[PDB]
Amino acid sequence: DNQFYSVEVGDSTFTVLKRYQNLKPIGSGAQGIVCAAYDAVLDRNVAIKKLSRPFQNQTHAKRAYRELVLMKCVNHKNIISLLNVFTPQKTLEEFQDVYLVMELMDANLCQVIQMELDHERMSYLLYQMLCGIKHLHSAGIIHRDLKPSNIVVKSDCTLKILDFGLARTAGTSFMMTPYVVTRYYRAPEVILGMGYKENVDIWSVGCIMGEMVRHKILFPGRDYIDQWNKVIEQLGTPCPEFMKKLQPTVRNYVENRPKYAGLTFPKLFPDSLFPADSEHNKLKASQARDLLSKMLVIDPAKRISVDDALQHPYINVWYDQLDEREHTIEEWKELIYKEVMN
Ligand SMILES: Cc1cc(NC(=O)c2cccc(-n3cc(NC(=O)Nc4ccccc4Cl)cn3)c2)ccn1
């Protein structure tokens, strides 16, 4: 009689439409609170994400709203597409939770990165990331925060980007919740507050690709201080022309850091990290190292574009505005509610 039922999945209560059966937590890789379930109507397995009081603060509200709007005007095989959106609450006054429903995947990209993958698999995952990223840019979305934990994969190696990245406006306001933001995949133009173009996302692809090879986060650190140190110790101090594009205060800090020549790409990614069993693999290792050297480039003006990355020999084998202004709790609640109601 009631269209919904509630079930305990870990520490969270999931109140879902009765079509969704056998809820099981994914736990990792995901994210917020995400369940696997059987959709009896579509006779297919789904993933269900619960957004708990998304209007509770400015940060959760901006992201919930922006992603609800974009998950509607984006249509691509390598970008999340929603099967359903619902709230168990009947009125705006009663409104609390948003549930998002998508195709159930098999792993997040962090798990895949931990595997010893062949060149076929590595090049195929990278091509899809580049394809999804190309789609976003054509829609006028520049991600800026692409990271493995918001990327999921199926057993057949098909890939999907689950989020839309950083807000147009800022400045990444505090989060009074026990969770940390992963910043290791952010481009120098993001680390140093610089201004950017489409290829800001190429750096993130390079960090993901390097980690697949190395099996260690390329640029770790407590925050941006430590992180920038990791970037300059490995790639070398950037050229004077890149530094003439930084804000005065940021420029001062960067130029006053000790100088590093930077390790060469064969030293940053030796042959021993790649299969050396055949001629086919010897060429694929040199092609992968060449693409890494074009992607992990501090200056964006000298960094490879999405289109040129797609045409790169390691990759091309696979070729076949509203509303970020300040709002109160009540305003965000209504804006989110009407998008949930469409
Ligand atoms: C055949 C099979 C596969 C299983 N899959 C996993 O265990 C697994 C592991 C890791 C990840 C995933 N995954 C995570 C997502 N979605 C989201 O993370 N978020 C999200 C969700 C809904 C709407 C919107 C968003 Cl953003 C999708 N699949 C599944 C489990 C059991 N059986």
The answer, yes or no, to whether any atom of ligand 1 lies below 6 A from the CB of 49, is yes
Q: Whose CA is nearest to atom 20 of ligand 1?
A: 49
CATH number at 107-322: 1.10.510.10
The single-letter DSSP state of residue 91 is S
Residues 29, 144: contact at Cβ < 8 Å? Answer: no
Q: Which of 39, 97, 145, 201 is catalytic?
A: 145
Q: Does the fold of domain 107-322 match that of domain 4-106?
A: no
Distance 156 CA to ligand 1 centre (A): 15
Name the binding residues.
Answer: 26-34, 49
The technique is: X-ray
Cα separation, 46 vs 177, in Å, equals 28
Cβ neighbours of residue 318 closer than 8 Å, sequence gap 6 or more: 123, 124, 127
Q: Whose CA is nearest to atom 3 of ligand 1?
A: 106
Angle at 127 between CA 123 and CA 129, to 5 degrees: 120
The answer, yes or no, to whether any atom of ligand 1 lies below 6 A from the CB of 26, is yes
Q: How many CB atoms lie within 10 A of CB 260?
A: 14
Q: How many residues does the chain have?
A: 342
The answer, yes or no, to whether any atom of ligand 1 lies below 6 A from the CB of 111, is no
Resolution of the structure in the document, Å: 2.0
* Known active-site residue 145: yes
| Domain ranges across the chain | 4-106, 107-322
Q: Whose CA is nearest to atom 18 of ligand 1?
A: 30
Reference 154, options 77, 67, 260, 246; nearest CA is 77
CATH of 4-106, one of 3.40.630.30, 3.30.365.10, 3.30.200.20, 3.40.50.2000: 3.30.200.20
> CA quadruple 264, 268, 272, 274: dihedral positive or negative?
negative
The answer, yes or no, to whether any atom of ligand 1 lies below 6 A from the CB of 118, is no
Cα separation, 40 vs 79, in Å, equals 25
